[PDB]
Amino acid sequence: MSREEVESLIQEVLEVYPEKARKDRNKHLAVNDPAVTQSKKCIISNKKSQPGLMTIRGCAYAGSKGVVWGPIKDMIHISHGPVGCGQYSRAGRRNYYIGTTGVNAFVTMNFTSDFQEKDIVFGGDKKLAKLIDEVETLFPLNKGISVQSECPIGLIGDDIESVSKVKGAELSKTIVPVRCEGFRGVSQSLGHHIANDAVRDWVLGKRDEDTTFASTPYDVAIIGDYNIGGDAWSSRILLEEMGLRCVAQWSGDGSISEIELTPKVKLNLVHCYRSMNYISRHMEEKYGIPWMEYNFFGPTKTIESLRAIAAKFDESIQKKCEEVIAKYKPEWEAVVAKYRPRLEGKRVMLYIGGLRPRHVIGAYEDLGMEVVGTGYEFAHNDDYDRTMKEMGDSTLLYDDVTGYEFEEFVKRIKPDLIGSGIKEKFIFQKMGIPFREMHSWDYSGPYHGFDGFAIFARDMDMTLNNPCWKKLQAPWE
Amino acid sequence: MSREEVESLIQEVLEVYPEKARKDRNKHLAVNDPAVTQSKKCIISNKKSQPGLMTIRGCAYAGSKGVVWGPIKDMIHISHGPVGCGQYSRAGRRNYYIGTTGVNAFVTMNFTSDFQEKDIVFGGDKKLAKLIDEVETLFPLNKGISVQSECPIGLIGDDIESVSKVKGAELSKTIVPVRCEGFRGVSQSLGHHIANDAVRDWVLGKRDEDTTFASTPYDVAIIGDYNIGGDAWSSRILLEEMGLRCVAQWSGDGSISEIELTPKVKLNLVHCYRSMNYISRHMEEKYGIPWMEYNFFGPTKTIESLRAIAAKFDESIQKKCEEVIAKYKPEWEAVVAKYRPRLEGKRVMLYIGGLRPRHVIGAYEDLGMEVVGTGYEFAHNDDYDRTMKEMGDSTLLYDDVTGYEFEEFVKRIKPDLIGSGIKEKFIFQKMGIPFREMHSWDYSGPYHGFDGFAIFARDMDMTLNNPCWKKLQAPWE
Amino acid sequence: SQQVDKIKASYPLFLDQDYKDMLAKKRDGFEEKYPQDKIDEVFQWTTTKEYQELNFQREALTVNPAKACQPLGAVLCALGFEKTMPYVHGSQGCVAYFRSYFNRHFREPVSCVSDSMTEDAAVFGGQQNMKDGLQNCKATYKPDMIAVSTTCMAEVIGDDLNAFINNSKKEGFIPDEFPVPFAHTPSFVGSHVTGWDNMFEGIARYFTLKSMDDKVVGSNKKINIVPGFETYLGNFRVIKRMLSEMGVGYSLLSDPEEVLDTPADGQFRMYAGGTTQEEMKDAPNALNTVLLQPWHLEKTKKFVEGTWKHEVPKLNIPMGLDWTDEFLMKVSEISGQPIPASLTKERGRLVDMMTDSHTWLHGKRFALWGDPDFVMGLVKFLLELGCEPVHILCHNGNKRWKKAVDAILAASPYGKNATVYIGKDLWHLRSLVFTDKPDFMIGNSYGKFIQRDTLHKGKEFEVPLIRIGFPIFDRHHLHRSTTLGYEGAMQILTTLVNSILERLDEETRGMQATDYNHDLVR
Amino acid sequence: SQQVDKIKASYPLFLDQDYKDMLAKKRDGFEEKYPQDKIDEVFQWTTTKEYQELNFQREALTVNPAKACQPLGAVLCALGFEKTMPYVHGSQGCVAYFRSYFNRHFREPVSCVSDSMTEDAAVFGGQQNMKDGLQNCKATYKPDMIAVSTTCMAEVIGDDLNAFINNSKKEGFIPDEFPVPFAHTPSFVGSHVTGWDNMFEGIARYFTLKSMDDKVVGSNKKINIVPGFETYLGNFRVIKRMLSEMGVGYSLLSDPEEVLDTPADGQFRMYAGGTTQEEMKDAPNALNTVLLQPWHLEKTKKFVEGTWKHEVPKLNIPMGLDWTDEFLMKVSEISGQPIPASLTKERGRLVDMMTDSHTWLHGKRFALWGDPDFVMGLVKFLLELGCEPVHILCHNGNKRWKKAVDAILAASPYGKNATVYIGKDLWHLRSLVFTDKPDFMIGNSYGKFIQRDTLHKGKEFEVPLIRIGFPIFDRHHLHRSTTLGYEGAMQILTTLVNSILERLDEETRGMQATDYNHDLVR
Numbered sequence A, B: 001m002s003r004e005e006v007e008s009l010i011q012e013v014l015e016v017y018p019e020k021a022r023k024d025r026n027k028h029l030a031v032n033d034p035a036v037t038q039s040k041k042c043i044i045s046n047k048k049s050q051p052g053l054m055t056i057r058g059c060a061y062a063g064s065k066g067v068v069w070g071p072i073k074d075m076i077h078i079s080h081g082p083v084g085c086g087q088y089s090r091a092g093r094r095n096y097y098i099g100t101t102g103v104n105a106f107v108t109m110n111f112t113s114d115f116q117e118k119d120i121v122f123g124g125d126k127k128l129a130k131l132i133d134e135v136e137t138l139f140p141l142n143k144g145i146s147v148q149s150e151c152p153i154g155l156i157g158d159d160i161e162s163v164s165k166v167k168g169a170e171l172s173k174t175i176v177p178v179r180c181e182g183f184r185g186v187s188q189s190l191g192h193h194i195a196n197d198a199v200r201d202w203v204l205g206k207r208d209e210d211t212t213f214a215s216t217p218y219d220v221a222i223i224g225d226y227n228i229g230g231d232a233w234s235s236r237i238l239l240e241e242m243g244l245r246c247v248a249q250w251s252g253d254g255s256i257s258e259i260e261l262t263p264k265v266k267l268n269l270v271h272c273y274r275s276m277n278y279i280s281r282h283m284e285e286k287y288g289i290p291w292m293e294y295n296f297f298g299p300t301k302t303i304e305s306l307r308a309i310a311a312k313f314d315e316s317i318q319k320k321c322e323e324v325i326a327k328y329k330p331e332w333e334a335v336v337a338k339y340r341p342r343l344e345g346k347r348v349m350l351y352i353g354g355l356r357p358r359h360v361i362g363a364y365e366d367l368g369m370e371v372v373g374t375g376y377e378f379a380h381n382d383d384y385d386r387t388m389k390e391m392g393d394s395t396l397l398y399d400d401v402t403g404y405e406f407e408e409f410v411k412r413i414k415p416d417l418i419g420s421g422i423k424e425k426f427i428f429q430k431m432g433i434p435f436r437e438m439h440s441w442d443y444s445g446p447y448h449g450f451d452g453f454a455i456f457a458r459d460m461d462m463t464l465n466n467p468c469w470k471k472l473q474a475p476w477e
Numbered sequence C, D: 001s002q003q004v005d006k007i008k009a010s011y012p013l014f015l016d017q018d019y020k021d022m023l024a025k026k027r028d029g030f031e032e033k034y035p036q037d038k039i040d041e042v043f044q045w046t047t048t049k050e051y052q053e054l055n056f057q058r059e060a061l062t063v064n065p066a067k068a069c070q071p072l073g074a075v076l077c078a079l080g081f082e083k084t085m086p087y088v089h090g091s092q093g094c095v096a097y098f099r100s101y102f103n104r105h106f107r108e109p110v111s112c113v114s115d116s117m118t119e120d121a122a123v124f125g126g127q128q129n130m131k132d133g134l135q136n137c138k139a140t141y142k143p144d145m146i147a148v149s150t151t152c153m154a155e156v157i158g159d160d161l162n163a164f165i166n167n168s169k170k171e172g173f174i175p176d177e178f179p180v181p182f183a184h185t186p187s188f189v190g191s192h193v194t195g196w197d198n199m200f201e202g203i204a205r206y207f208t209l210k211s212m213d214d215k216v217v218g219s220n221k222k223i224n225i226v227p228g229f230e231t232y233l234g235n236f237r238v239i240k241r242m243l244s245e246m247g248v249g250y251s252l253l254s255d256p257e258e259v260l261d262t263p264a265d266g267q268f269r270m271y272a273g274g275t276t277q278e279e280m281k282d283a284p285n286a287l288n289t290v291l292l293q294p295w296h297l298e299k300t301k302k303f304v305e306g307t308w309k310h311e312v313p314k315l316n317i318p319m320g321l322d323w324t325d326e327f328l329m330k331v332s333e334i335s336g337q338p339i340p341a342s343l344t345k346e347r348g349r350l351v352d353m354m355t356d357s358h359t360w361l362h363g364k365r366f367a368l369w370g371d372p373d374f375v376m377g378l379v380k381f382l383l384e385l386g387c388e389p390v391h392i393l394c395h396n397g398n399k400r401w402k403k404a405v406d407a408i409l410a411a412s413p414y415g416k417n418a419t420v421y422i423g424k425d426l427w428h429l430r431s432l433v434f435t436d437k438p439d440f441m442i443g444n445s446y447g448k449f450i451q452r453d454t455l456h457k458g459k460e461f462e463v464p465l466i467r468i469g470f471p472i473f474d475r476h477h478l479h480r481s482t483t484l485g486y487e488g489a490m491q492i493l494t495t496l497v498n499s500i501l502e503r504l505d506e507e508t509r510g511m512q513a514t515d516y517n518h519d520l521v522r
Ligand code: CLF
Pocket: A059, A060, A061, A062, A081, A082, A083, A084, A085, A086, A149, A150, A151, A181, A182, A183, C069, C070, C071, C091, C092, C093, C094, C095, C097, C150, C151, C152, C153, C187
């Protein structure tokens, strides 16, 4: 489709909306121009969702509890408020970890203060203090507690910071109050920020006077990899084969100790810029630790990333970098030789959260696929800045896409494959369009690194080329 | 029901039959008189079944392969002839064993010569010789082979005796020809006899000239326990607790070696008279080994049997006898205290093969139940002689009962429980009469010995008093 | 490393020696992990009677709840109406969660909107959200009806739904005649089942309260059926099937089965099937109204009795033999239709299966959980089967319900060893299945973590999960099953007996050890 | 010993120390057992490629067949006719076995008589047996029809059924017009399915050969459906349901669904339902005749084509998506009825389920066996699901069939690693699942022994059985399932995908070892 044609599709789709909604949604849909490096000239982002239009976005609690804190495996995270939020978010996100669940690790459990009417009317601070004692009795190997505030907490004016400071002192325990109520912000995105600031304020400074950690020139931390289906482990393996020492993973398979040891590293390696640029900035301001963005989706980006990271160190690391790249060369070459002929030319449309909608493009292109539309739930303009150069000329961008818009775009563009979330999947399967879950990896993965690329390629192929898709039309119609 | 009523029931039922069948069936139905010690005055048995009347009986092959030979665990038994007989009888009978199936033990496997038309036309002896070599290659730890003739073998004039002698000589392996073709006899019974004669002729004498086995005065064998659901194990444990040494078990969990050692024992203990009296008589004739019948169904009979057996030995065994009886006294007493109040007065009708129709009556009486009808598929008059004294006066006896007769007897007598086989079970359940499988023990058991009695009592209770029997009438009818 | 012709996903990729070594190094280097002996000591302690006593003294902490919040139930109720958009007034984060919860269970699209109230709405309230939200939703997704529920932000700040909707109509954001029933659905009261009741009572009020003058009980010769919160498609289907077989005029009020089972034929159908507005309007003209799940339809019942003047009969959920029989007999009495020979035979076929399977079922011990009506139906059927329902857990249960279940248990010899627990969660149930081990658990997908826990103590302590209830996320297409009526009883019987036999096969699969009992025929 | 409150059956009674000690003593003293090291050595050898090569060179020995003898199938065929007694001429031992085999699979009564030929009949044959047998059967069980087959004794002796039945009528043992169709059913030719074909063609010929003069193809406006040997009740049901939904007049010729599922209502019904004599007599007046299992209905097909002059369509068994499509389109063509909206929707629900479940099914490797039509339909459906049917065994298969299945495999990328085996048994299959291990077996209960054998080598070598076929003896009520049509496909899909996910849950249940992949949502 031409630029003029895509422009005319955007206008057709917006004809359905009332004036107010139409005027707004026009600002959140654009035809890509890779020349343009100031995205604020072409698209608006990180604004409120228009009421009634079936946004796909979640809330600040999902960004804090579901995303940043939930994965920290040796803490107990309290979903503080009524029962719903903690139940729907219970084990929905495949932030993988090693541990003995219920004993030293607690990720897939749902701890909640289960507010009743009396808690709404008279406040939950007394209940929170009692909850904390009960947690200490029944879960004695927890290494800290987080309090993840649901909508009512701030509305009723509870003082979780007080409870956290008083109980923390009494029990000699890290108790982190997190003001991630879902009424704050417009999306998951503010929940990241809040969660980062909570790490900063209650956890990260704990070893500031402690000089016992035996640091080395090659210490790094993986910042903003939540280890979806093992993604962080298949990233870490490569970094350590290159001669680096991965002191921390934030926060997939993450421990509280490795968060506290992070100010001791030499370089912060940021995968998810959107969710953890805040704490990365802070560590450079306070500890003088530099940070850099990297991408481990597919061989092209992974090789580029390994070489950029190695270039920060000395000749010994740069040499191991080339050893690693030579080792995996035959493996990803074999993947490409097998799957690219099966996928070449196929056109993909993506819709995901704050990073993957641009970060996976390289991986698709390594299999000869074209990303013909992409967009984000909750990205900021700094994300779109990074996107416009990664997408082709005259491709379709969409910010906070509506259910309606997404459907109509797909009907016209007729992609060969869509990569989006669970709320999208069953719609597109009905329409006869191959669909891969690009949050949960469709219970597969990992997709990061060289070992991840094999699975990714397998997965796009098994779905795009599945026999089921030829079968949607009854032979008598 | 009185003698007059039951005689009137027999006459009403026989009314449906053509004259020839009526005249025959009248001779196989009788009203018990416990005074009578010559059953040949009261009932005839072990005659041909009337065509077309839906007998429950099997054939000679079932009596040889399925009953006597099949359980011997370290021999391979060849169902010689077409594919049917071997397949239907493959693992239907729960003759339990300890072994490594397909390696040193073969009981639940179905080996067959799967005759095709060319074998029928030109004979199966060449196929049998080639089958034996193939067995030897693929099953090298087999300690012997039996050849169990199906109907066609003798009809087509095959000479399995010659193949067995030649191949047996060639391989120095015991290869037993058994002429148990289904056209022989009138039932499973003649299969027993044939099978016993085969053991005698080809196996039992092997160690006649060997003096290496070290006998003791307390050496016994269990003859005619096929270890259904472990029945022989729960018998054997008592015998050894009493200070006996059980050299062989025929044929449940039996090995060829323990069969070959049997002529070395002091006393043969016969459980199933019908199936194994032939070989027992032989071993008394040839080796001077005395035999006695016993019964291990229920505490009264088990106690009586232990005492009777012990009386054959010395004071040390009679002493240990009383120790065993004292050990299990509280156990079976607790079983009676729990279950007899749940079963007292309940009336049972039984129909089984050649032993259990009389042997289980004591067990029922130990729970206060009354056996009001019993009969046998293939018993002889010596079995009925042993029955008339175990059954109450004016109770109903039936030999080779027809399906028709059995349904009509039950409709009139309205027993609380029926105990029969798989071909009967689902009929009576539809009529709302609790049914227990008294062949397979309904996948339960053992029922032998003190440990068996507990299971038996459990099982009669769980079925007879099940809530399902209250629900057969729709509450709108 | 990967080998291209046998690619490894996370399991078993991370069992390769290089990953194992790397993860050991991460643990030892940086995790400051409790020593394994101490982890095993604590684990063993969490299995004890002593730990259970502490566990059962919790007042403030909930761990692994077995309930959700009101608006989830409001959404499911709404989806059951023709061309109806569920609309939750308040916070959008909630709607993302509702949709995905149901998406994962039904493996179907789930359409639901929010009006995306933000922090700013705490000053004013969300009246503007409602006006633009209703307008936007109607124009964009073209529903014939919008059914409005609430998130906890809207309940706490105190938005008057009624006034907001009226003001929306007054100011012309939606037509005056466009149906916009509503319900307050506070997440901090009761559970998702309460949400369902609240929403249904709202829709029923909307269509009938103000037009009662012309209604005559019995004039339409139908029976209304109200299913309540129901996540098995087979359950809507079996009720309609039995009533059609009987020749009984009926109206199923809230019927999502079409919209939760659309064909994959090249188009997406946002709406399918469902109760019509005509059916709701005409429902007061029914002979009576039958409530399939009375223990969460109490508000509905007060409305139907108080306004429609229907003499709602005292029926248990039609689960198992006795209660399906009672349901059919009541329907026969109300409708005047005899129970036909088809249902009589089906009944006898279930009884036949009971007689066939009774020996394997007899005395089997179960822990189970779920919503109150489901749980009591499961308890009832288990007693009918001669099983022992020893741990009965209903997180969202009440005292009256518990008394009713206690009476049911007291009326059977099979109820002797059974305890009912209300307000307790799956961390409580975990203790029970360690200290008073049952044979199986009957429950939703959350139970798989309890089975993992039990296996860790040892194979002989493992308690297998039998998945019946909601949600089921780790098996496919179980939401097509039936639990109601004779058909549902057959399905449950079959699942249970075969779960017993599959387990027996596993324990007897050991060559020359336990395989003496590995029978071909069971 | 026993404790009265927790009585132990064989498992686990015999694991008590005293029984273990006793069994050890028995073995050591009297069994002269091979040393365990040698048992292990031989076991390990039976798992090897070397052993498989010897195993596949067998010519004389059959081990663990996957077929039965003709008369079993004749019996089942006869049971599908109204008030018909199956009657096997020859030896009674056979009938005891036929009834028990079916009793164990259907958990139902199975009525069948023998005429109890003994050794005495070798002299002149069984003419008197037939004469008294028919008279006795007719008087006692009052059938409306006796359908006569043969056991192998009667075939070897060469009894002429036709003459014996004619002489029975001539001499007045049964009435001249009492229907006594017959078929020769030699156990040493083909298998049970051949017996079904023979019996059916016998009955067809009985009712139609001599009355052809007044018949007109198409005049009754129905389609005849011949199901073949079928042991899933759901398969007879679903055919009748689909045809009824289409408004297609049809006659199902051999229909045992009623007599194999009578209610337990306090009476035994020896006969229920079934194809009427009026239906068989009128069958030549149909538009056409469809064979659901054509690979064992070749004799029937020759008679239907040659005598009834129906142009029997070239149709595969309606299993899976494509072949259910083709069946419905053929029936539409013949009947002139369109495929209705209801079946079109059901079709799309199947396709939806396929899209939902495809990622878990993709590339999954299966061993399978059964009768030829069943196996090729399963093979077809597996390819549709993107599965790899690597070991395809049909003991009773023939060369022409194998060529047909080889073609189906060739028309799919998913067929590339598949081999079809004919004339081979489950001991052959055992070797294949060791040397070229699949993920799962799809088979009958006899498969459980192969699963036990694989586990013994090691947990990582275990190949779980998925029970689909005949016979199934060690699970309850699976005979109520469906394999045909869209309904059957849905049932098979669901069974397969959930077998996969159950095994993954087992492999990932290991606390702190494999449970990183013990996902709540799959
Ligand atoms: S944005 Fe929670 S699901 Fe809601 S009605 Fe309240 S219990 Fe239920 Fe985010 S914090 Fe959570 S999830 Fe929403 S409520 Fe807010």
